Write a protein that binds this ligand. Sequence first.
Ligand code: NDP
Ligand code: 53T
Length: 157
Amino acid sequence: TLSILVAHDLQRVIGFENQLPWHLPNDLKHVKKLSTGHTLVMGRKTFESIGKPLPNRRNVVLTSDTSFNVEGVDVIHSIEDIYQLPGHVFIFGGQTLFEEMIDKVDDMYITVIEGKFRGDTFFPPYTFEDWEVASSVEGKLDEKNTIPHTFLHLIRK
Ligand SMILES: NC(=O)C1=CN([C@@H]2O[C@H](COP(=O)(O)OP(=O)(O)OC[C@H]3O[C@@H](n4cnc5c(N)ncnc54)[C@H](OP(=O)(O)O)[C@@H]3O)[C@@H](O)[C@H]2O)C=CC1
Ligand SMILES: COc1cc(-c2cc(C)cc(C)c2)cc([C@@H](C)C#Cc2c(C)nc(N)nc2N)c1
């Protein structure tokens, strides 16, 4: 299984200056619930913006840098290498990897942040014409999580 995993706002912003534009503890909980024991694939800039591998899953970084080595992180050098990875693989980031991967994934897991943020990095455009809503669950607003967000699981038609 090859899925996308992504949080994006109303205009499809996903990043700003190496950050998530927003602070949403619920979404980070959802990510580690979904991907624990699985594989996260990410471009070099996504990885460099986090800074360490994420515990209790495989962290695969895609780069053309042959010197690139980080403890706890496997390295691949072509989009093609992705398809040789055993298990449930989630495309995790970023703009440029989603651009490469969106036409190929079986499956998309999207948190829609119902806000409009300043951003520099975007998720690709997509129509529900091609994707069917497996599920749509509103996140709960509270003290810590103060932006409306919706979990969508979209499956290619
Ligand atoms: N809110 C969210 O859900 C998420 C936010 N983000 C954001 O994304 C931002 C990064 O922007 P973006 O440019 O998209 O970066 P990416 O994370 O997609 O990394 C891009 C790099 O990945 C490598 N790469 C991509 N495709 C290939 C390929 N086909 N062959 C070899 N190497 C490849 C290259 O690395 P190299 O140049 O070293 O050769 C490329 O420069 C981050 O700052 C982060 O905030 C990302 C994902 C999710
Ligand atoms: C800039 O700093 C970053 C930190 C993290 C991060 C760090 C830790 C310690 C834990 C977790 C769960 C995420 C992730 C990212 C980027 C790569 C992301 C993401 C992403 C999100 C947040 N939500 C959904 N749904 N999908 C996604 N692909 C950037």
